[PDB]
Amino acid sequence: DPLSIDERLQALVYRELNNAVAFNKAESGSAVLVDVNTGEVLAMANSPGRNRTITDVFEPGSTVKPMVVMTALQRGVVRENSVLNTIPYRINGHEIKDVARYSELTLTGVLQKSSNVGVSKLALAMPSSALVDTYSRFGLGKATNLGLVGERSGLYPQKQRWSDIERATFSFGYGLMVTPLQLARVYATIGSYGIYRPLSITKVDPPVPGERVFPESIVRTVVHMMESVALPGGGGVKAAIKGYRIAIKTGTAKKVGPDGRYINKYIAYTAGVAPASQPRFALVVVINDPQAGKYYGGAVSAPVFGAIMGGVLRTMNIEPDA
Ligand SMILES: CCN1CCN(C(=O)N[C@@H](C(=O)N[C@@H](C=O)[C@@H]2N[C@@H](C(=O)O)C(C)(C)S2)c2ccccc2)C(=O)C1=O
Numbered sequence: 001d002p003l004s005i006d007e008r009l010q011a012l013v014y015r016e017l018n019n020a021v022a023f024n025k026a027e028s029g030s031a032v033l034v035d036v037n038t039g040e041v042l043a044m045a046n047s048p049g050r051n052r053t054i055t056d057v058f059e060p061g062s063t064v065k066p067m068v069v070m071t072a073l074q075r076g077v078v079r080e081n082s083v084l085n086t087i088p089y090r091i092n093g094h095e096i097k098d099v100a101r102y103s104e105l106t107l108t109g110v111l112q113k114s115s116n117v118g119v120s121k122l123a124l125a126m127p128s129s130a131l132v133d134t135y136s137r138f139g140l141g142k143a144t145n146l147g148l149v150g151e152r153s154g155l156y157p158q159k160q161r162w163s164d165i166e167r168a169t170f171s172f173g174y175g176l177m178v179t180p181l182q183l184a185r186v187y188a189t190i191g192s193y194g195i196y197r198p199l200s201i202t203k204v205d206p207p208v209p210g211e212r213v214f215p216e217s218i219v220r221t222v223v224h225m226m227e228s229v230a231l232p233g234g235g236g237v238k239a240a241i242k243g244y245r246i247a248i249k250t251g252t253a254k255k256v257g258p259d260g261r262y263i264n265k266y267i268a269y270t271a272g273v274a275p276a277s278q279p280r281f282a283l284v285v286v287i288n289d290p291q292a293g294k295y296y297g298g299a300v301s302a303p304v305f306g307a308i309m310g311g312v313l314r315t316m317n318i319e320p321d322a
Contacts, residue, residue: 036191
């Protein structure tokens with residue numbers, strides 16, 4: 001009753017998640033929905049119910065990329081209209097390449113096409129501490145404190161010195177492990193334009209004072225850029241919702257084994273905020289080990305993200321902004 005969960009939104013999330021997990025023949029799926037102004041968890045669901053995926057840890061992969069662009073802008077490595085050389089290259093034999101090859105991309109392009117090359121060149125242009133600092137500001141490598149077992153088990157680098165390959169892979173979301181709850185908190189901080197708040201499972205009266213972790217102007221710039229992910233040419237186009245602008249990012253990660261080996265099992269993500277013009281909600285959707293033939297975030301997680309976010313916007317009577 002001081003519980004923040006809105007059961008209308010919980011039931012919607014559960015139903016859509018159940019359907020997506022079944023359709024993709026996946027092990028499981030999770031969705032976490034957060035009010036970006038208060039940190040209230042409005043919905044939090046695992047499918048199947050007893051697969052406690054919301055508190056399991058995973059490499060966040062390309063979902064970290066918006067923070068990379070924010071950091072490069074803050075440090076003056078790039079400007080709003082910058083164009084990056086995105087030609088694939090090598091680091092000591094390690095090949096850095098994108099799924100789709102481009103010789104150059106704008107910062108919007110880098111997010112739209114999810115360019116590993118583009119973000120890695122940004123990272124190598126900055127000290128190793130730069131992204132460590134930003135990810136930390138957004139709450140990665142800090143526990144969530146909702147009182148759920150597992151909440152605290154994420155892996156985050158405490159390293160003093162970094163190799164070139166480590167710095168690059170960090171920029172596209174490997175070499176650290178986070179829970180869906182931590183990722184939802186990142187995106188809630190994006191939706192607030194740089195105000196960090198802890199997640200709450202209990203009701204609060206707004207406004208809720210938070211911690212300014214990043215300038216409003218920078219976060220707003222990248223939120224606009226993320227709108228391209230949900231338009232034609234963008235990886236998350238299947239999340240698009242009629243009448244609304246959404247700001248999202250897709251991701252796909254190969255699962256790492258305990259000996260550090262990557263296996264042919266996938267984790268698919270879509271994380272974002274809506275409506276993009278003035279965010280009310282942050283949503284993270286994770287689909288664990290899809291087996292039905294598709295495994296990219298845009299194919300597997302983006303459709304259910306659109307169905308959930310669309311249902312939320314309608315239920316909460318949010319004014320169409322498209
Ligand atoms: C550190 C070693 N190691 C770990 C494994 N690994 C990795 O799993 N790579 C994935 C990757 O690059 N992931 C995405 C970030 O999420 C990019 N965005 C995706 C999206 O938007 O869905 C995309 C369009 C599919 S590519 C990938 C690429 C292609 C297919 C599946 C997964 C690495 O690359 C990597 O170096």
